mmCIF file of N, CA and C and ligand atoms in Angstrom:
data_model
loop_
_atom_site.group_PDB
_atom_site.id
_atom_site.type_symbol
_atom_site.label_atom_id
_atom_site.label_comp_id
_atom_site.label_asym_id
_atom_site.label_seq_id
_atom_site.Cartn_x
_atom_site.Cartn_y
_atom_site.Cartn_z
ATOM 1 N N UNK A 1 0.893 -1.183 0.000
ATOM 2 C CA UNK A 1 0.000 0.000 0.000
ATOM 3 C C UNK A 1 0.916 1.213 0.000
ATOM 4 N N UNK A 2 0.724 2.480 0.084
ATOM 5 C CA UNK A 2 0.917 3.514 -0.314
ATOM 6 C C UNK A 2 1.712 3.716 1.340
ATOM 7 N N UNK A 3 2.817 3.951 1.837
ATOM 8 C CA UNK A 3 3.912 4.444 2.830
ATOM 9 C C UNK A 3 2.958 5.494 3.251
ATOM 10 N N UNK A 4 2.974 5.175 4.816
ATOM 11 C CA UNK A 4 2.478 5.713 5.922
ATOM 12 C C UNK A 4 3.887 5.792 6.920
ATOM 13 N N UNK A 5 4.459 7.219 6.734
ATOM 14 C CA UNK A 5 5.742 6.670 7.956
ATOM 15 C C UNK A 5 5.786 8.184 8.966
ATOM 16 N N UNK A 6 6.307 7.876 10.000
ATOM 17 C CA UNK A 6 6.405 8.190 11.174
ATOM 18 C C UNK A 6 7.506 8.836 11.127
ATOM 19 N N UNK A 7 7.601 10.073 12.104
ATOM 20 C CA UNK A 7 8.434 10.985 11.955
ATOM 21 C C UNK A 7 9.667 10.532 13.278
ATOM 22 N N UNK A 8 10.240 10.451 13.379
ATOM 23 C CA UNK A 8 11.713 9.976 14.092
ATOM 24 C C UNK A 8 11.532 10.077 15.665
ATOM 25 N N UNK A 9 11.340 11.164 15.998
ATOM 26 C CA UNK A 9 11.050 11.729 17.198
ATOM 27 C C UNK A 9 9.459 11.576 17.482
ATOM 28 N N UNK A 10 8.754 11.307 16.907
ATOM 29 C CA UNK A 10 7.583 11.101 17.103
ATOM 30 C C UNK A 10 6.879 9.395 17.202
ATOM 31 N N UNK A 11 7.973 8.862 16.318
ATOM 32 C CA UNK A 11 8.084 7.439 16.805
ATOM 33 C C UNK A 11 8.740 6.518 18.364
ATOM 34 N N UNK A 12 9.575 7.230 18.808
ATOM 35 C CA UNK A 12 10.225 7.768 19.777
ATOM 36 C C UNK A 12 9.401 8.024 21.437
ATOM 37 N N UNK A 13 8.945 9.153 20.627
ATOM 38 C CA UNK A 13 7.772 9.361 21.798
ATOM 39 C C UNK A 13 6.457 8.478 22.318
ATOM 40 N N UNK A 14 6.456 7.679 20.644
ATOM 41 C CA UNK A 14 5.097 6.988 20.794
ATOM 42 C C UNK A 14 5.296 5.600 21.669
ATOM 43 N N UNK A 15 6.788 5.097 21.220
ATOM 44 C CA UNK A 15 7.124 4.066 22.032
ATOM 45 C C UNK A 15 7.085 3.937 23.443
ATOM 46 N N UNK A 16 8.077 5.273 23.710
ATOM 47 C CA UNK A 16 7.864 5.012 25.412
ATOM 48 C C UNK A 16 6.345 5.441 25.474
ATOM 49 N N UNK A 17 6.027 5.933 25.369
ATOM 50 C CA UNK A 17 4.423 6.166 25.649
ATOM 51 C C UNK A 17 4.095 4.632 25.889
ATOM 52 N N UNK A 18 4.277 3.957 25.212
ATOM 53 C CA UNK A 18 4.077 3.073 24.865
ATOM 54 C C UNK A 18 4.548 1.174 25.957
ATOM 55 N N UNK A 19 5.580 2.172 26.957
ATOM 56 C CA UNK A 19 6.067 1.297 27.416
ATOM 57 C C UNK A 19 7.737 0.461 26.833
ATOM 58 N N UNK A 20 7.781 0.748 25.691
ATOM 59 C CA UNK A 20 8.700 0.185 24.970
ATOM 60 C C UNK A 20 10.273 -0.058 25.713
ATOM 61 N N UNK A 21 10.382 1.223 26.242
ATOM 62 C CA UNK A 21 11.527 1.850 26.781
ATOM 63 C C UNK A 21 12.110 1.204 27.792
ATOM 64 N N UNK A 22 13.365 0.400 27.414
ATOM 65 C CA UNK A 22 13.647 -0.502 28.325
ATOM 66 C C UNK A 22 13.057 -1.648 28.588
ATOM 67 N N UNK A 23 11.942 -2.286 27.912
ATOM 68 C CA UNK A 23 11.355 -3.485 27.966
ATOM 69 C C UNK A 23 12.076 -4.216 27.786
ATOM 70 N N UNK A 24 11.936 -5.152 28.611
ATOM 71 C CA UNK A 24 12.790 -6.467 28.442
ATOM 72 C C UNK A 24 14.486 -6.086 27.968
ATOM 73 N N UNK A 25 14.855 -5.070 28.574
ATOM 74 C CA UNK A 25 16.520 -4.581 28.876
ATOM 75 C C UNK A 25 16.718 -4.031 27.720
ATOM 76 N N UNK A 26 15.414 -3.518 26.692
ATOM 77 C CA UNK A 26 15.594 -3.253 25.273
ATOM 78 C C UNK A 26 15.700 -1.501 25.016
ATOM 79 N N UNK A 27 16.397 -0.854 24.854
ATOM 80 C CA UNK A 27 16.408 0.820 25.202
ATOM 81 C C UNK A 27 15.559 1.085 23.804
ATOM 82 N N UNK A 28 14.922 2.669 24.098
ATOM 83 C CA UNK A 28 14.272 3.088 23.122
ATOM 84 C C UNK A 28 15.163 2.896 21.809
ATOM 85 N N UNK A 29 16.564 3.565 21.399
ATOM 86 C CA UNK A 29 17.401 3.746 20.951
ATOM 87 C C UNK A 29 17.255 2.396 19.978
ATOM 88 N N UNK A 30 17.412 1.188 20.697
ATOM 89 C CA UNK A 30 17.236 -0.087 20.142
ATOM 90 C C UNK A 30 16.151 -0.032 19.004
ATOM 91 N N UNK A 31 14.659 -0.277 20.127
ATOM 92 C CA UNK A 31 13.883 -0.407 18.974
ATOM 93 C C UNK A 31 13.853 0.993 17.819
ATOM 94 N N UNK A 32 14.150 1.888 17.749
ATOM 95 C CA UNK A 32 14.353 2.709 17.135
ATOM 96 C C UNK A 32 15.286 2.521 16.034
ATOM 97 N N UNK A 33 16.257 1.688 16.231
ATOM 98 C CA UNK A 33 17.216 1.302 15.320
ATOM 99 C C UNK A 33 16.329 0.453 14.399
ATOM 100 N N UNK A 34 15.554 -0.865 15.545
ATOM 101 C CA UNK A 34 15.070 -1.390 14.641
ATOM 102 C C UNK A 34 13.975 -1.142 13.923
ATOM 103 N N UNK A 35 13.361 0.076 13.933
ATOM 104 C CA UNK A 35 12.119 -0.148 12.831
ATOM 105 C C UNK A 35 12.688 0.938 12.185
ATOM 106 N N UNK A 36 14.356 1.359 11.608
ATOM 107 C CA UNK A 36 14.514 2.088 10.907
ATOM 108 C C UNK A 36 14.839 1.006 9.776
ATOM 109 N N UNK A 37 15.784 0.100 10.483
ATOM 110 C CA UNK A 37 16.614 -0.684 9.435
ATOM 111 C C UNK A 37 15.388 -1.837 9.001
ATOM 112 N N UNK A 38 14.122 -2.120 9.790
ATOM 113 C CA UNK A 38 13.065 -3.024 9.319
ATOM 114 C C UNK A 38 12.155 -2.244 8.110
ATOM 115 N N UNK A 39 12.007 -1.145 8.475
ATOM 116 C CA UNK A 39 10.614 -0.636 7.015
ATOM 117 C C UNK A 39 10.792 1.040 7.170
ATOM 118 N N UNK A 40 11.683 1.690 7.586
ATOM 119 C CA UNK A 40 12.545 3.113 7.236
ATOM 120 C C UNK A 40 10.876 3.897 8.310
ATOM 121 N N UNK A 41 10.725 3.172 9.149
ATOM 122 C CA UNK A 41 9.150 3.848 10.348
ATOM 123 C C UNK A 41 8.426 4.295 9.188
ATOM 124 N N UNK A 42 8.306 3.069 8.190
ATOM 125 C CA UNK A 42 6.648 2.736 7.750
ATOM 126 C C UNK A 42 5.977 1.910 8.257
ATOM 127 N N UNK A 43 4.248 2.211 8.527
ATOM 128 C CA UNK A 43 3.540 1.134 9.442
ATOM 129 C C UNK A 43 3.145 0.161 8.283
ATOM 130 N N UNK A 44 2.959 1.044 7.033
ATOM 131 C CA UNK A 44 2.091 -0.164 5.898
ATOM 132 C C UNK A 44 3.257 -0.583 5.378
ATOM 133 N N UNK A 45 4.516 -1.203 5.974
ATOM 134 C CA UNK A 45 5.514 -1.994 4.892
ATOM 135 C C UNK A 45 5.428 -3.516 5.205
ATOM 136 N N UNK A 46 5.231 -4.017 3.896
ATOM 137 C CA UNK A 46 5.397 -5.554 3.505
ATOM 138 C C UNK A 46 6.411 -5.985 2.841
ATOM 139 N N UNK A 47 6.669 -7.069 3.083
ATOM 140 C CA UNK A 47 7.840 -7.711 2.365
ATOM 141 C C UNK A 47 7.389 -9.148 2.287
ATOM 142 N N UNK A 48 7.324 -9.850 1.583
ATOM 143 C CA UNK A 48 6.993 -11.385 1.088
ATOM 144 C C UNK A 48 8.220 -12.080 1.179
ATOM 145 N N UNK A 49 8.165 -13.543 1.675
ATOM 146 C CA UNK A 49 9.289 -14.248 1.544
ATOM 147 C C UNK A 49 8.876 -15.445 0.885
ATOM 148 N N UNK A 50 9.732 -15.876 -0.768
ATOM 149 C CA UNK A 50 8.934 -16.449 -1.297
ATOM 150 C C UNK A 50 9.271 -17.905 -1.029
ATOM 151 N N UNK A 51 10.267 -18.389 0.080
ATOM 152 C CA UNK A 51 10.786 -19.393 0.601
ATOM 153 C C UNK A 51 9.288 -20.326 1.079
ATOM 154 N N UNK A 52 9.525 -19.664 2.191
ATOM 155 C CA UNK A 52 8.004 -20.074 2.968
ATOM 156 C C UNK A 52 6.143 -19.603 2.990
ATOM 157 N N UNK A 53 6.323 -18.948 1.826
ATOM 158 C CA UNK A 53 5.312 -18.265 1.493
ATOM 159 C C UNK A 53 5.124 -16.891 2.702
ATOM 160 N N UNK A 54 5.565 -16.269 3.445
ATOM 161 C CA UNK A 54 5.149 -15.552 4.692
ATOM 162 C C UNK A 54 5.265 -14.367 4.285
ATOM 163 N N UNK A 55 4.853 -13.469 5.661
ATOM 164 C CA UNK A 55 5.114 -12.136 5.218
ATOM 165 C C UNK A 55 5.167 -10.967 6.447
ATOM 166 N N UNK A 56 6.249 -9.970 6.263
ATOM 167 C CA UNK A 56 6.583 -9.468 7.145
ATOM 168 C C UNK A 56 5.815 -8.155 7.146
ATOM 169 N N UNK A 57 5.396 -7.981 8.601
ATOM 170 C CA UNK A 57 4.122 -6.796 8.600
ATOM 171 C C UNK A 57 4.818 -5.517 9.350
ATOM 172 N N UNK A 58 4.671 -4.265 8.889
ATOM 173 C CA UNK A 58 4.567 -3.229 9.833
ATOM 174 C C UNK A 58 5.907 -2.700 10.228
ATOM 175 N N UNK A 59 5.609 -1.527 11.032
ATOM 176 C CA UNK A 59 7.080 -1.301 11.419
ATOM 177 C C UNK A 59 8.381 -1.782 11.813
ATOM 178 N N UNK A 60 8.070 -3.225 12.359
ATOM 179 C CA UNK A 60 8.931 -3.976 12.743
ATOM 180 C C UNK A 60 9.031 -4.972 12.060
ATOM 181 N N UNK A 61 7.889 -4.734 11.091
ATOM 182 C CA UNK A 61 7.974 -6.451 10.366
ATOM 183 C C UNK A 61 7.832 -7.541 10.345
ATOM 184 N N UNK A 62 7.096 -8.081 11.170
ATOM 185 C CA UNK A 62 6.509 -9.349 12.074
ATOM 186 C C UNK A 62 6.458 -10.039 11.135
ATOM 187 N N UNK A 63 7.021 -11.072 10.973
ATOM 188 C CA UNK A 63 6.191 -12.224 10.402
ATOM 189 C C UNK A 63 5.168 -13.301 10.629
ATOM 190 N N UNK A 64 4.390 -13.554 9.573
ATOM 191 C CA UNK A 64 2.909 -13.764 10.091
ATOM 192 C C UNK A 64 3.197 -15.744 9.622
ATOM 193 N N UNK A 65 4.631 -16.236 9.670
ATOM 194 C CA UNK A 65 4.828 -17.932 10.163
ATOM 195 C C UNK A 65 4.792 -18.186 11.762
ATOM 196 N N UNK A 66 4.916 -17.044 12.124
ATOM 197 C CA UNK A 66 4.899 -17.549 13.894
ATOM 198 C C UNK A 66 4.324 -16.583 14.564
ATOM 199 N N UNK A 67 4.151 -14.963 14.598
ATOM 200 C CA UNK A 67 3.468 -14.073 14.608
ATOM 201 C C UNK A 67 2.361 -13.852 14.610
ATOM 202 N N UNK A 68 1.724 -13.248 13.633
ATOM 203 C CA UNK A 68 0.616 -12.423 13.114
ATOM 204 C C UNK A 68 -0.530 -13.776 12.387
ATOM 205 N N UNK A 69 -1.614 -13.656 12.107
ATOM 206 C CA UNK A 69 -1.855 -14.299 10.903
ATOM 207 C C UNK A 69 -2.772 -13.212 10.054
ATOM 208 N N UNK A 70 -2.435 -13.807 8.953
ATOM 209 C CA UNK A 70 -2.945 -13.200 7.521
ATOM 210 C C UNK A 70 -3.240 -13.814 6.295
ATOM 211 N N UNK A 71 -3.444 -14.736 7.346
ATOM 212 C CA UNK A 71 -4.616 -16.034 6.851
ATOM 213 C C UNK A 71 -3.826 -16.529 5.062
ATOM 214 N N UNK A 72 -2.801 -16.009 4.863
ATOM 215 C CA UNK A 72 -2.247 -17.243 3.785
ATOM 216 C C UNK A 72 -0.886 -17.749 3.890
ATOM 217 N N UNK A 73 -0.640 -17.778 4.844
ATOM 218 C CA UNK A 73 1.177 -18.530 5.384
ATOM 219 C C UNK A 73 0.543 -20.044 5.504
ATOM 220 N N UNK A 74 1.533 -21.114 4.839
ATOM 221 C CA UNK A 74 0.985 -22.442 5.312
ATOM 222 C C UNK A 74 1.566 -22.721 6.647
ATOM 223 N N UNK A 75 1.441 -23.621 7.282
ATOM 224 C CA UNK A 75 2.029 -24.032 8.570
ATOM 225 C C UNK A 75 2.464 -23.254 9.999
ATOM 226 N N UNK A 76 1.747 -22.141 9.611
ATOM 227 C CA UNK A 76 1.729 -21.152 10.639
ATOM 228 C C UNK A 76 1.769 -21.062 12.446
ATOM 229 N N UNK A 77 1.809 -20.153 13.387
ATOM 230 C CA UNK A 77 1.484 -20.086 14.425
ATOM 231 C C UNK A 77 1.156 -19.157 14.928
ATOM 232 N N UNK A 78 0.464 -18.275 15.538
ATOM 233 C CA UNK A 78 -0.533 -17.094 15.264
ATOM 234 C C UNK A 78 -0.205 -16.633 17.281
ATOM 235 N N UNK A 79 1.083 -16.686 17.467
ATOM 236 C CA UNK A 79 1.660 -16.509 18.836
ATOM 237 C C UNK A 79 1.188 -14.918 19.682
ATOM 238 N N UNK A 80 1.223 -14.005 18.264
ATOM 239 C CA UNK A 80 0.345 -12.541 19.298
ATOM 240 C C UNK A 80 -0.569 -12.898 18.987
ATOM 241 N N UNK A 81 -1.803 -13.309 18.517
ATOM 242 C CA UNK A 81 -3.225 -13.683 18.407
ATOM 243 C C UNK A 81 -3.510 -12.053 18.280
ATOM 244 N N UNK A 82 -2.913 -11.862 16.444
ATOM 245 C CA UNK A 82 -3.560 -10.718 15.991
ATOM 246 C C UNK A 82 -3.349 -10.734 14.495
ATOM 247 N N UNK A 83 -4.387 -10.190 13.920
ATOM 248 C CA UNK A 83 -4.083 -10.631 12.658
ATOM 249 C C UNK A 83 -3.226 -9.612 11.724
ATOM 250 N N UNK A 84 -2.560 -9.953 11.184
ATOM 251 C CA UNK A 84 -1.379 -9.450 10.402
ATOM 252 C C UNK A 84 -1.823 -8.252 10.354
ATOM 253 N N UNK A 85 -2.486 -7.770 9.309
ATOM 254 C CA UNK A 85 -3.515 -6.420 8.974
ATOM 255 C C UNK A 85 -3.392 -5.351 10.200
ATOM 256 N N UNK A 86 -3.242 -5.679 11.518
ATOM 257 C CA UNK A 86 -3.852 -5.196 12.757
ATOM 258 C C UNK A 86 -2.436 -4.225 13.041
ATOM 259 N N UNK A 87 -1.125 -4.715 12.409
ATOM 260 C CA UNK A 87 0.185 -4.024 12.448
ATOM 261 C C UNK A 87 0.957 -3.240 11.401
ATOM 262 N N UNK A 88 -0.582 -3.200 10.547
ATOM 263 C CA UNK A 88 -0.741 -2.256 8.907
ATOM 264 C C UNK A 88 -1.501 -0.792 9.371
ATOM 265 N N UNK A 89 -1.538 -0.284 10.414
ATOM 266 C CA UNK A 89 -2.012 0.831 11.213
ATOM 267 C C UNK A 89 -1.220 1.852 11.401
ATOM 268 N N UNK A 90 -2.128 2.974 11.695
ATOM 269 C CA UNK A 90 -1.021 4.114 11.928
ATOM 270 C C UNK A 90 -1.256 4.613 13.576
ATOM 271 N N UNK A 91 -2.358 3.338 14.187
ATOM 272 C CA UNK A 91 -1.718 3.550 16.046
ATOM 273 C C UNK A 91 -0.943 2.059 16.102
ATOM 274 N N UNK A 92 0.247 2.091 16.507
ATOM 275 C CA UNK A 92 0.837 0.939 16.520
ATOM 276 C C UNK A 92 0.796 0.167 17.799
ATOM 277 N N UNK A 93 -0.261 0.285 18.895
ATOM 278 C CA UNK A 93 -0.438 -0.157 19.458
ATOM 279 C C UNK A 93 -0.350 -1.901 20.029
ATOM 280 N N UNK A 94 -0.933 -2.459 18.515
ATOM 281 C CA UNK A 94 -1.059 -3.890 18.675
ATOM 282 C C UNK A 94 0.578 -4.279 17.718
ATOM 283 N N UNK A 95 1.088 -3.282 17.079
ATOM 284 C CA UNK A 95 2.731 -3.307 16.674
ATOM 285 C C UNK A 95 3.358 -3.473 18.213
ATOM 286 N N UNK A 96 3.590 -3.474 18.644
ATOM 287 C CA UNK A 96 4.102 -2.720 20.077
ATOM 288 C C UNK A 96 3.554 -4.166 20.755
ATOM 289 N N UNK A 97 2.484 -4.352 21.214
ATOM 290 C CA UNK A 97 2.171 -5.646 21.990
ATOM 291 C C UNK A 97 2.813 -6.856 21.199
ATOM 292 N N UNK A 98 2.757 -6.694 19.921
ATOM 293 C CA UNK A 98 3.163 -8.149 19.331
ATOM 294 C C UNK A 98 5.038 -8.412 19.316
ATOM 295 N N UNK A 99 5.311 -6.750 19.189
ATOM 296 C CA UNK A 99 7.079 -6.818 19.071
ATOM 297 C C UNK A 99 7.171 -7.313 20.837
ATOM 298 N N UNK A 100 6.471 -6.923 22.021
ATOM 299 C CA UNK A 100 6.746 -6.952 23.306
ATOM 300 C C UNK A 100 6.644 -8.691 23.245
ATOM 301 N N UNK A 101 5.751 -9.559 22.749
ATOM 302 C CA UNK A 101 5.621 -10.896 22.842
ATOM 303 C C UNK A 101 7.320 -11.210 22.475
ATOM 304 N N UNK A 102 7.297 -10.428 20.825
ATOM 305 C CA UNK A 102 8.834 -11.182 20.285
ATOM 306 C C UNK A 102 10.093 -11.324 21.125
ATOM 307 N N UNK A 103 9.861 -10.140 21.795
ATOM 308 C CA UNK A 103 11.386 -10.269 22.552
ATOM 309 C C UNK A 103 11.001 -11.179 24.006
ATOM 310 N N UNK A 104 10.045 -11.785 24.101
ATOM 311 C CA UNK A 104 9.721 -12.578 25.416
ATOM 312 C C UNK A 104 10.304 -13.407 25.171
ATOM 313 N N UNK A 105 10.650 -14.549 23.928
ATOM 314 C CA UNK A 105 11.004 -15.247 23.316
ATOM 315 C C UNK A 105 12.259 -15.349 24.259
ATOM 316 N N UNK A 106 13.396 -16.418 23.948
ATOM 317 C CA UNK A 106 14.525 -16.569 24.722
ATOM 318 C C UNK A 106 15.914 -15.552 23.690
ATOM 319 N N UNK A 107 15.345 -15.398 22.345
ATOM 320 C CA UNK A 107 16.879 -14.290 21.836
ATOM 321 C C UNK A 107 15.942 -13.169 21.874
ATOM 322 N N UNK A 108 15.382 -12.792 22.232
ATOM 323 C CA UNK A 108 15.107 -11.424 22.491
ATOM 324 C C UNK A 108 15.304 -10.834 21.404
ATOM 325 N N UNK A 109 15.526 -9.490 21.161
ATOM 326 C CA UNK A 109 15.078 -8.789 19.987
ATOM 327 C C UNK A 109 16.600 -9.638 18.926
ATOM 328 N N UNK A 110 16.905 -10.212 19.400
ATOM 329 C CA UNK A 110 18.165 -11.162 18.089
ATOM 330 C C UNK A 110 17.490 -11.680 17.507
ATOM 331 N N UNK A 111 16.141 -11.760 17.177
ATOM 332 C CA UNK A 111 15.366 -12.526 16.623
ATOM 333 C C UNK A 111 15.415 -11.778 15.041
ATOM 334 N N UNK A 112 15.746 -10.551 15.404
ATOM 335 C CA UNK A 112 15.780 -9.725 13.906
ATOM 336 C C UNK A 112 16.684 -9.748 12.961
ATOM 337 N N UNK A 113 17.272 -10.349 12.361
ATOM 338 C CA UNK A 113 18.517 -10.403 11.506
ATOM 339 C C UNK A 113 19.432 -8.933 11.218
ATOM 340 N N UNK A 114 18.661 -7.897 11.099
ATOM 341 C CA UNK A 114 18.696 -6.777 10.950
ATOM 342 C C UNK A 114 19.072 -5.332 11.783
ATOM 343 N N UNK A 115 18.583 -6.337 12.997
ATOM 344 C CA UNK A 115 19.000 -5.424 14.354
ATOM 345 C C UNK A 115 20.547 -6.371 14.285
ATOM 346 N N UNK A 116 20.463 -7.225 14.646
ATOM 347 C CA UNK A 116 21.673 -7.585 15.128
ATOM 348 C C UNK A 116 22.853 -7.166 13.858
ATOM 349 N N UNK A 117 22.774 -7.170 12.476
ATOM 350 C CA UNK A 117 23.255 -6.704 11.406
ATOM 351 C C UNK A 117 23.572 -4.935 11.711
ATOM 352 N N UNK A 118 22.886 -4.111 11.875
ATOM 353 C CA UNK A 118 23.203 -3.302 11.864
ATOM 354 C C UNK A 118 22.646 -2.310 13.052
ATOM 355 N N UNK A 119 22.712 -2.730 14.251
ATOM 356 C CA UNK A 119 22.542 -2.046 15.460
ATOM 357 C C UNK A 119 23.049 -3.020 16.570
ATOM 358 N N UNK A 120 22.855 -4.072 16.991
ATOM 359 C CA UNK A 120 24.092 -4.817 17.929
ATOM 360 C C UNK A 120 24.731 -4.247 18.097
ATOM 361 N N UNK A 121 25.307 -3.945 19.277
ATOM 362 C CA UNK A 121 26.519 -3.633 19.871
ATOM 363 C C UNK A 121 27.454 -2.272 19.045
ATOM 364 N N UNK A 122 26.771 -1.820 18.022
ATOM 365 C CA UNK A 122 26.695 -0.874 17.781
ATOM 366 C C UNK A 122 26.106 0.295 18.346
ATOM 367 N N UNK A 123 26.761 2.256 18.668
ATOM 368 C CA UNK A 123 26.234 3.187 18.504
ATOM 369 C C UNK A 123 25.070 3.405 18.142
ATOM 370 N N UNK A 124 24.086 3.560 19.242
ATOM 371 C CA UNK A 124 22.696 3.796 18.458
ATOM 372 C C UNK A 124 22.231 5.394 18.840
ATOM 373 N N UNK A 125 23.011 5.599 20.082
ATOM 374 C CA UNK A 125 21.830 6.771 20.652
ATOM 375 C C UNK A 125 21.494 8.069 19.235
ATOM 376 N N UNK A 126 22.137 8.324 18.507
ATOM 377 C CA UNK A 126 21.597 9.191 17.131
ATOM 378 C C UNK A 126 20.018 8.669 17.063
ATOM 379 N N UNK A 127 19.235 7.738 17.477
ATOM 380 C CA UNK A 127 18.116 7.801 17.319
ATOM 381 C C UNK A 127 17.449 8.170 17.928
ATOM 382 N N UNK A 128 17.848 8.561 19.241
ATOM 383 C CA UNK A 128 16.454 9.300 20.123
ATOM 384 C C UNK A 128 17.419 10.812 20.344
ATOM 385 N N UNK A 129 18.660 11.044 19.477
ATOM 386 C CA UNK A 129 18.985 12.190 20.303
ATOM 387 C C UNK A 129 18.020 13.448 19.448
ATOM 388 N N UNK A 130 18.063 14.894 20.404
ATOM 389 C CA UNK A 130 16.757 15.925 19.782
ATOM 390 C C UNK A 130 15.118 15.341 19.914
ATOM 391 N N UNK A 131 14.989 14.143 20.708
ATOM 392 C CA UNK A 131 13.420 13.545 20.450
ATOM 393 C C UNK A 131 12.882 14.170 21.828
ATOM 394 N N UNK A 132 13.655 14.646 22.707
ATOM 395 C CA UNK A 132 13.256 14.969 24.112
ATOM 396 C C UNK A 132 12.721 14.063 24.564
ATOM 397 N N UNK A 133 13.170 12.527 24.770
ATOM 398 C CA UNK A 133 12.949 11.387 25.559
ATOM 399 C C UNK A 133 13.753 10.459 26.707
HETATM 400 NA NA1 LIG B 201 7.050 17.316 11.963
HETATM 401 NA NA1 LIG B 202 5.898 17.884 9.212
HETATM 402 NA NA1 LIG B 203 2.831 11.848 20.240
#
């Protein structure tokens, strides 16, 4: 669909609002990294993987094989009990509950190929600095 994205500092704000901040030992900075390097803080970004048929939803990108459902992944598991669509929004509310499930998981936000690629143990604070958070 047509890019719905979120302004830096305003994504920022929405998180901790949100609780995000420091969840599960995860700093804003973090997830901030990651929904830059996942969909550049677009909520409507998709990406198809044509391996397993799946598909990655939303700012963070969830995939809907163990995630989300969106009712056409075969062999699925529907672990936030929300449907894919629900993290195609511009309140990311149920984004936010379903990324909080992901990192419950035992690798925690390593679950992202992308975080750990290019924010691990890497310099992040440039993402919340000027956000007044
Ligand atoms: Na603005
Ligand atoms: Na503006
Ligand atoms: Na706000």
């Amino acid at each position: 669909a047509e890019a719905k994205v979120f302004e830096r500092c305003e994504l920022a704000r929405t998180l901790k609002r949100l609780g995000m901040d420091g969840y599960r030992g995860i700093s804003l900075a973090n997830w901030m990294c990651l929904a830059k390097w996942e969909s550049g803080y677009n909520t409507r970004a998709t990406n198809y993987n044509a391996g397993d048929r799946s598909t990655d939803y939303g700012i963070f990108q969830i995939n809907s094989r163990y995630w989300c459902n969106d009712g056409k992944t075969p062999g699925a598991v529907n672990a936030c009990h929300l449907s894919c669509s629900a993290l195609l929004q511009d309140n990311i509310a149920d984004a936010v509950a379903c990324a909080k499930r992901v990192v419950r998981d035992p690798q925690g936000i390593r679950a992202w190929v992308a975080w750990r690629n290019r924010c691990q143990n890497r310099d992040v604070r440039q993402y919340v600095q000027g956000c007044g958070v």
